[PDB]
Design a protein around this ligand. Structure first.
Ligand code: UPG
Ligand code: UPG
Ligand code: NAG
Ligand code: NAG
Ligand code: AKG
Ligand code: AKG
Ligand code: FE2
Ligand code: FE2
Ligand code: FE2
Ligand code: FE2
Ligand code: MN
Ligand code: MN
Lengths: 696, 696
C-alpha cells in the first residue's frame, strides 16, 4: 500500500481559467495535493489548439523536478489542467499504478502524432491503445527527473514528440521501465475514443467507464478537438450533478450591481407590447439598469413608441436604435455589448431577445447570484423540445442533440450546465468583456450566423457558456410564420402561442370560473353566464370587424327559425378568423359547456360564427326566433351605457331578460324548443356581440 | 176576368196514396177546389206503369160530367193525381186558359203514342210540342161533356188514344175549338222534356220554368218514366222547401209505439263493441223495443257474446241469428222485416246497420214523430260526400248524382226529402209492411243487390222513401279494407275512421287539456305532463306488443347518448304500427307541443318509436343519457302499484323525479343538452311505456 501522502499532482496553468478551476475542484473532491506551475507567467508554448507545442510545460516541470531528483519515495502524476478532470481517488490511483508494474506510466491514445512515421517503432498491442500521449503520466519522482532533465528545447517545441522519442528508445524504455496505459486503466484520452467512454453514475458521484476495456479511468483528458465532450462530462464527473445531490457547484438556494439591459427586436415578433410592459415588472432596481433597445422592424415602431415614455421614466437611462439606422443584427449586438464593455460602470450585461418570455421576474438576480462569466436561463418553446441552448455540435458546428439534452429540457436533471451554445437570453460579466473578449466583432466579422459567432467567440477563449434550469425562467415565443397582414395580428396567434394568447385575450377569470367558486351565474333558467373574453380581445375583435367594414344587408340569411330572420353582421369565414374562433370554442367554450350542463358532451362544431352590429339607424333589434344549434354562445363585445344604450336578450317562455350584459361575458343557452328569445332594441350608440350556433 | 169560383179541378184516385196527398197539398196551397173520383173503388184500368190503359178515368169523368152538361159558366181542369203537382194559382191558370182562345186545351208532349202512325194527322207546330197527352186538360164544362160523353169502351182501354182520335178529327177539332198547350204554358209533361224543366225559386214558394219556351207552367205531370224526377221537383214545388221557410211539411220542431229494432252485421265492421254498447244508450224506452241481430261474421261472435247479457237485460226481447245459420244478407233482412210484419204488436220497424254511427240518441223518436211510411236519417262518411241515400238513378238504376245532392249532404238545405234510394238506417211503419208490402221477398228474389231490391220494392208500390237531414243524426264508418289480421284491428283504424278512433283511443281529456283550463302540468322544469291515450288504448297497445312477443335483447342499439344505452323494447316498425303512430304524433302530439312550447313548430318527425318493457328479471332500469331528439314523448301504458312497483323518470340536472306516473298520460321534455335523465328501477311486476324521439 503506497501512502497517498507520497503522491503529488503537478500541472501547468498560466491563468486561473474556468477549466483550471474545474480541474482543481475535481482534485479537491478526492483530497489530491496539487502544485500548479507558472500561474503568473505568460504562455510561450504557442497556439496549442492550432499547432503543436507545449514545450514550456516540460521546462517548468524539469525545473520543479530538480528538488525531487533523489526522492524514490515520491510518486508524481503530471496532467494538463485546462482540459482535465479527475474521476478517481488517490488510493485507487496508486493501487492501479503499482498494479501496472511500471516506473513511469504515460497515457495511451489511438493516434500516433506529431510524426506518423514513428508508428512502426511502437511495440505491438492487441486490443489496447498503442501510442503515447504526454497530457498525463505518473511515475516515481526519480524516474521522472531522469526523463524531464533531458529537456533542452524551445518553449514552442512539441513536448509530445519529446516524450515520444524517449519512449521509443528501446534501451531507455527497458532501463527506466517505461510503459503506456494501453487499456485506459488510469488515463482516458477522449480524442479517437468518444464511442468508448460512457458515464457511470453512483448515488453522490459520477465517473466514466471505458466500455471497450471495462475500466474506470482516473484521469479524463479532453485532448484535441474533444473540449466540448469534456465540458459535457465535466457537468457530472466527479460531483457536478449526482442523482441524490443535484448540482454540486450551483447555488440551489447594499446596492445591486449596475446592469446594461439590451433588448433586440430582429424580426416581427408577437406580443411585443406585453414584452415591453413586462420590462417594467422585472424584479431589479430600475435605478441600476440602463436600457438599450434595437428595433429592426418598422412593424414594431408604434409598439416601441407607446411604451417608450414609461420605459424612460422607469430605468436609469434608455437608448433606442430604430430601423432607420439600417443595422444588421450582428452590428446591433456588437454595439450594445460594446456599450457595456467601454463603460467601466457596467458590471453586468443582460441581453434579452424579443421572443424570450420571462415568467420569473427574478431572472436577472438569480443569474447574477450564480457568479458565472456567462450564464443563460433555460427557455423552451411551450410543450416542445426546442430551447435557447444546444447540448452538442456537429463537426461543422451545426446543431446536434446531446445525450442528456432531453433530460435537461424536461428538467429531469436540474442545475447549471456547461453547454456549447446559448441564445436569446444571457447575462455576461462586464469584467469578462473588458479583460477577455475586448474585440468589437463578437457577433459580426464572418459569414456565420451572429448567434453562432457569439458562442464561438467565447469558446475560442475558453470561456464557459453556462445554462441554468435550476428554476423555471420562462418560455420562447413562436415567430416562424407570424402573419403581419392584420390590424391586430396577435388575434391570430391562438395556434402558435396559445399560452400567451390566453393571458392576453381570454378573460382573467375564465379559469377560476371553470373550477367553480361561484363566478358563473344563471340569470335565466338554463341560461348560464360566464366570463370568456378579456376587454382587449373584445376591442381588437370589434376593431378588426370594422376594419373589414362589409357588414350584412338585405337578402342575408341566417340559421334562425321563426314562424327569414337576418342580422347586420360579419361571419368569421369572411374575415378569415373561422379556424381561430373554432379553436377558442374547442379549448374554452367546450369544456365550460360540459361543466354547466352535466351529461352533455361537445366537440364544439359551429358553422355559424358571426359578430352582430346593432344600431338605431341600421338594425337595432332581433325579433323572436330559435337557433339552428344545440346551444348558443352569446358574447358581448362592448360596454352598455358607455358604447350603447338599449336592452339585450329576452327569453320569452321565462319572462326573463338579460337587461345589463357584461362586456367580456358570454351567455350559454339552448337554441331549440325551449328558449324562444328576442334581442331588445338598441336605442343609442352601437352594440356589438359575438355569437356561435354550436352543435347544429 | 174569369171567376176562380167557377173553376173546378177533377182528378181520379182509387186510394189516398202519398202521391195523391202530395197533389192535394199543392192544390190546397193555391186554394183550388178539387173533386176526387173513385176513392173507394178498385182500379180496373190495368197496370198503367207497364202498358196502356186508364179508360176507367174517362168513365168516372163522363158520369161526373152529366150534371154539368149545360154549365157554360164552369171551367173544369182534369189532371192525374198520383204523379201531378200544381205550381200556379187558379187566377194565373184561368188567365192563361183565356189567353189560349181555346174551349178545351189538352196538354202537349214530345211523343206520339200509343199509335205512332197518327203523327201525320197532327197539325204542324214549329218549336213547340206536337202531340196530345190526356194526363191534363182544361176547358168549358159544356165542351168537356160533349167529348167525354162519347166514351163507350173498356176500363183497361187507352184513354190517351180516345182523346187523341177525337182531337185528330179535323171537323170536331174546329167545331169545339180544341187545342194543345204546345209551349207548356199551363201543362208541363216531364217525359221527353227533362232538359227543358228547371226550378225557379222565390222567397216562400218554388215553381218550374220551361227554359225552351220561357214559360212558368201551372201543372207539373211526371208522366211515364219520370216519377222520380217529379219526386225531386215535389220536394220544392210549390211549398215543399223554400229559401226563407225551410221545409213546408216536415216537423222542424203516454207509452210510445212498440218497435222492432233489427241490427245487421254483414261484413267485418270496425268499432262494433262501441256500436253494441251504443244500443243501450238510444233514448227510447227499452221495454218497448224488441232486438233482432243478424251477425254474418265469425270475427264478431266474441263481440256479440260480450254484449249479449247487457242487451238481453235491457230490451223487451232479443234474438240472435249467428253465422252458423248461413243466411245471406237478403235472407236476413227479409226475415227480420217479416218478423215485424207477422207481429201485429210491431208498430214500427227500425233497421240499423253496423256501420251506422248514431250520434243523436233521439233518432228513433224523431223519425217516428215525422209520421212517414218510410223515413231514413241522413248519415254521411265523415268529411266526404258519400252517404246513406241517393238523389238520382241512372236508367239502369245504378247511382247518379242529383242536382241538389251536395246541398243536401252539406245540409245547405235541410228538411225531409223524397229520394229514390236509402240504406243503412230507416224506420218503416208496421202497418205499411202488412197492408202494402206483404210479400216475403223484399230484399231477395233477384240477382240485384238486396239494398237496391228493398228500395225498388217500395218504389214499385208508390211508397215514398223519405230522408231527413232536419237534424244531425250521425255518420257512416269506413268498412272497405278493414284489416282483421290483428289482435285489436281497431288500433289500425286511425286513418279510415279518425273520429271514432279518437273517441275510443285518445284520452277523453286531451281536447280539454289542449284548450288550456289547467289540466296540463309541469312537474319538472320544461317537462310537461298531459293526458294523451285512453286506458283502452294502453291495454290494447300493450297486448299487441306481447302478442308479437319478440322483445329486444343484447346487441340492441338505440339513439341514446351517454358517455351504448339499450332497452328491452319493440319498435313500431317491427309490428307494422309506425305509420299509425306517426299519424297520432302529427294529429295529437304536434299541436300539443306547439302550445306548451310557444315559438316551436313541429311536423312530428320520429324515426325512433318503441314500447319499452321494464322487469326485475330483465332490464328494470335505464341509466342516465340524452336523446337523439329535439323533444321526447314518454307515455305510460299501465298503472303503478297495480301492474308494477318501482320509480319512473329522474331528471338529474333538476333533482326532479316523476315518481308516480299516470297511465294514459304523456311526458314532454327536451332530449338534448339540459335534460340528462334516467329511468328508475322497476322493483316488481312489469312497467310498459311508449316513447318517441321526435324531430331528430
Ligand atoms: O495559455 C495556456 C495554454 C495552455 N496551458 C496549459 O497547457 C496545457 C495544454 O493545453 P491544451 O488545451 O490541453 O491542449 P491539448 O488539446 O491537450 O493538445 C496538446 O497536446 C500536447 C500534449 O498534450 C500539448 O503539449 C500541447 O500543448 C497541446 O497541443 C493546458 O491544459 C494548460 O494546462 C496553459 O497553462 N496556458
Ligand atoms: O191504382 C191506380 C192507378 C192509377 N190511378 C190513377 O190513374 C192515373 C194514371 O196513373 P199514372 O201513374 O199517372 O200513369 P202515367 O205515368 O201518367 O201514364 C198514363 O198515360 C195515360 C194518359 O195519362 C193514362 O191514361 C194511363 O193510365 C197511364 O198509362 C193516376 O195518376 C192516378 O190518378 C189510380 O187512381 N189508381
Ligand atoms: C478529505 O479530508 C478531510 C479532512 O482534511 C476529510 O474530512 C474528508 O472526509 C476527506 N475526503 C475524502 C474524499 O478523502
Ligand atoms: C186561401 O183562402 C184563405 C181563406 O179561406 C185565405 O186566408 C188565404 O190567404 C188564401 N190563400 C191563397 C193562396 O189564396
Ligand atoms: O341580441 C341578442 O342578444 C340575441 C342574438 C342572438 O341570439 C343571435 O345572434 O342569434
Ligand atoms: O324510463 C323512463 O321513464 C325514461 C325512458 C326514456 O327516456 C327512453 O325511452 O329513452
Ligand atoms: Fe349572419
Ligand atoms: Fe338566437
Ligand atoms: Fe330500442
Ligand atoms: Fe331518454
Ligand atoms: Mn490537454
Ligand atoms: Mn200521370
Amino acid at each position: 500500500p503506497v501512502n497517498p501522502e507520497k503522491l503529488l499532482v503537478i500541472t501547468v496553468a498560466t491563468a486561473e481559467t474556468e477549466g483550471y478551476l474545474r480541474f482543481l475542484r475535481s482534485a479537491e473532491f478526492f483530497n489530491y495535493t496539487v502544485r500548479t506551475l507558472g500561474l503568473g507567467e505568460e504562455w510561450r508554448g504557442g497556439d496549442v489548439a492550432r499547432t503543436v507545442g507545449g514545450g514550456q510545460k516540460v521546462r517548468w516541470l524539469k525545473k520543479e523536478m530538480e528538488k525531487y531528483a533523489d526522492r524514490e519515495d515520491m510518486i508524481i502524476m503530471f496532467v494538463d489542467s485546462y482540459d482535465v478532470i479527475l474521476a478517481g481517488s488517490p488510493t485507487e490511483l496508486l493501487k492501479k499504478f503499482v498494479q501496472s508494474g511500471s516506473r513511469l506510466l504515460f497515457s495511451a491514445e489511438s493516434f500516433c502524432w506529431p510524426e506518423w512515421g514513428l508508428a512502426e517503432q511502437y511495440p505491438e498491442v492487441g486490443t489496447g491503445k498503442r501510442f503515447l500521449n504526454s497530457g498525463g503520466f505518473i511515475g516515481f519522482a526519480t524516474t521522472i527527473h531522469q526523463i524531464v532533465r533531458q529537456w533542452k528545447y524551445k518553449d514552442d517545441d512539441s513536448d509530445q514528440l519529446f516524450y515520444t522519442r524517449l519512449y521509443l528508445d528501446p534501451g531507455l524504455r527497458e532501463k527506466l521501465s517505461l510503459n503506456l496505459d494501453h487499456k485506459s486503466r488510469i488515463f482516458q484520452n477522449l480524442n479517437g475514443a468518444l464511442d468508448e467512454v460512457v458515464l457511470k453514475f453512483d448515488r453522490n458521484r459520477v465517473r466514466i467507464r471505458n466500455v471497450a476495456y471495462d475500466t474506470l479511468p482516473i484521469v479524463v483528458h479532453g485532448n484535441g478537438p474533444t473540449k466540448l465532450q469534456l465540458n459535457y462530462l465535466g457537468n457530472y464527473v466527479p460531483n457536478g450533478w449526482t442523482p441524490e445531490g443535484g448540482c454540486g457547484f450551483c447555488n440551489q438556494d447594499q446596492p445591486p450591481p449596475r446592469v446594461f439591459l439590451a433588448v433586440f427586436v430582429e424580426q416581427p415578433t408577437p406580443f411585443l407590447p406585453r414584452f415591453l410592459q413586462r420590462l417594467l415588472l422585472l424584479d431589479y432596481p430600475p435605478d441600476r439598469v440602463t436600457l438599450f433597445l434595437h428595433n429592426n422592424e418598422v412593424f414594431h415602431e408604434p409598439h416601441i413608441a407607446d411604451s417608450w415614455p414609461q420605459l424612460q421614466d422607469h430605468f436609469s437611462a434608455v437608448k433606442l436604435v430604430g430601423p432607420e439606422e439600417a443595422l444588421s443584427p450582428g452590428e446591433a449586438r456588437d454595439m450594445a455589448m460594446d456599450l457595456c464593455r467601454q463603460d467601466p460602470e457596467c458590471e453586468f450585461y443582460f441581453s434579452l431577445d424579443a421572443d424570450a418570455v420571462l415568467t420569473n421576474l427574478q431572472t436577472l438576480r438569480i443569474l447574477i447570484e450564480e457568479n458565472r462569466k456567462v450564464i443563460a436561463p433555460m427557455l423552451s418553446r411551450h410543450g416542445k423540445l426546442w430551447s435557447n441552448f444546444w447540448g452538442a455540435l456537429s463537426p461543422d458546428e451545426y446543431y446536434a442533440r446531446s445525450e442528456d439534452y432531453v433530460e435537461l429540457v424536461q428538467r429531469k436533471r436540474v442545475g447549471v450546465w456547461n453547454v456549447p451554445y446559448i441564445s436569446q437570453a444571457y447575462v455576461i460579466r462586464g469584467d469578462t468583456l473588458r479583460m477577455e473578449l475586448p474585440q468589437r466583432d463578437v457577433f459580426s466579422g464572418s459569414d456565420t450566423d451572429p448567434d453562432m459567432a457569439f458562442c464561438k467567440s467565447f469558446r475560442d477563449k475558453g470561456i464557459f457558456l453556462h445554462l441554468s434550469n435550476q428554476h423555471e425562467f420562462g418560455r420562447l415565443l413562436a415567430t416562424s410564420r407570424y402573419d403581419t397582414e392584420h390590424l391586430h395580428p396577435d388575434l391570430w396567434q391562438i395556434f402558435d402561442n396559445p399560452v400567451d394568447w390566453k393571458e392576453q385575450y381570454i378573460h382573467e377569470n375564465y379559469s377560476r370560473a371553470l373550477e367553480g367558486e361561484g363566478i358563473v351565474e344563471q340569470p335565466c333558467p338554463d341560461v348560464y353566464w360566464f366570463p370568456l373574453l378579456s376587454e382587449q380581445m373584445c376591442d381588437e375583435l370589434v376593431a378588426e370587424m370594422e376594419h373589414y367594414g362589409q357588414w350584412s344587408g338585405g337578402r342575408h340569411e341566417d340559421s334562425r327559425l321563426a314562424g327569414n330572420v337576418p342580422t347586420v353582421d360579419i361571419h368569421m369565414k369572411q374575415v378569415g378568423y373561422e379556424d381561430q374562433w373554432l379553436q377558442l370554442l374547442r379549448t374554452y367554450v367546450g369544456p365550460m359547456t360540459e361543466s354547466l350542463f352535466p351529461g352533455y358532451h361537445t366537440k364544439a362544431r359551429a358553422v355559424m360564427n358571426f359578430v352582430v352590429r346593432y344600431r338605431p339607424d341600421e338594425q337595432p333589434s332581433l325579433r323572436p326566433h330559435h337557433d339552428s344549434s344545440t346551444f348558443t354562445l352569446n358574447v358581448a363585445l362592448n360596454h352598455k351605457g358607455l358604447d350603447y344604450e338599449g336592452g339585450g336578450c329576452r327569453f320569452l317562455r321565462y319572462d326573463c331578460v338579460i337587461s345589463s350584459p357584461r362586456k367580456g361575458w358570454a351567455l350559454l343557452h339552448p337554441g331549440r324548443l325551449t328558449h324562444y328569445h328576442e334581442g331588445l332594441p338598441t336605442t343609442w350608440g352601437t352594440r356589438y356581440i359575438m355569437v356561435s350556433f354550436v352543435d347544429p
